């Protein structure tokens, strides 16, 4: 259970967000929302489902992260929920919440 | 990987069951497809119900009349891993009566 800190954006300026590398994308997204909306009135906060999680990697472009996609580990009838470690998200990664 | 034969019925309309060979490792979706193809043998595609409009009902005197699905509250979990439900998951026995119910 390695902790990480994300540089979270709502898409200009990044905010630190404490997460674990074994958090699912859903779990990490909650934690990001908690920091990013802290100063936003209740009535102005979007529904989380209208946002996607976008990892803007340093050197290799942007990627939408989700709990289930073409990358998910499958073994016969079994499937693993995608985590931050699954995607190889490093400590200090810039991650944006973007219109879905 | 045990073969099973189900006693398959339609739940609407007026011993009535027809035999359907399945595998116990078939998903509910897969079992449903095999049940429709036997029950509706001879009936053109255009005269068959959309499969998504039917639920699979296992009429057990022991477990109850259960609606079976590929994914539900009973699905096996292990950490972050979830398994699709099969006939073996529900422990549907050989010769089980299973109905297709308008859904």
From Swiss-Prot, chain B:
Expressed in which tissues: Highly expressed in fetal kidney, and at slightly lower levels in fetal brain, lung and liver.
Effect the entry attributes to changing residue 66 to F/P: Abolishes interaction with RAC1 and RND1
Residues the UniProt record annotates as site (Important for interaction with RAC1 and RND1): 66
PTM notes: Phosphorylated on tyrosine residues by ERBB2 and MET upon SEMA4D binding. Proteolytic processing favors heterodimerization with PLXNB2 and SEMA4D binding.
Annotated family: Belongs to the plexin family.
Function of the protein: Receptor for SEMA4D. Plays a role in GABAergic synapse development. Mediates SEMA4A- and SEMA4D-dependent inhibitory synapse development. Plays a role in RHOA activation and subsequent changes of the actin cytoskeleton. Plays a role in axon guidance, invasive growth and cell migration.
Record's subunit section: Monomer, and heterodimer with PLXNB2 after proteolytic processing. Binds RAC1 that has been activated by GTP binding. Interaction with SEMA4D promotes binding of cytoplasmic ligands. Interacts with PLXNA1. Interacts with ARHGEF11 and ARHGEF12. Interacts with ERBB2. Interacts with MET. Interacts with MST1R. Interacts with RRAS. Interacts with RHOD. Interacts with RND1. Interacts with NRP1 and NRP2.
Name of the protein: Plexin-B1
Phylogenetic placement of the source organism: Eukaryota, Metazoa, Chordata, Craniata, Vertebrata
Gene label: PLXNB1
């Amino acid at each position: 259970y390695r902790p990480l800190t994300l540089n979270a954006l709502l898409a200009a300026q990044g905010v630190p967000v404490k997460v674990l590398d074994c958090d699912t994308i859903s779990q990490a997204k909650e934690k990001m929302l908690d920091q990013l909306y802290k100063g936003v009135p209740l009535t102005q906060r979007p529904d989380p489902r209208t946002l996607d999680v976008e990892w803007r990697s340093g050197v290799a472009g942007h990627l939408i992260l989700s709990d289930e996609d073409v990358t998910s580990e499958v073994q016969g009838l079994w499937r693993r929920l995608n985590t931050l470690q699954h995607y190889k998200v490093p400590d200090g990664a810039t991650v944006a919440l973007v219109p879905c």
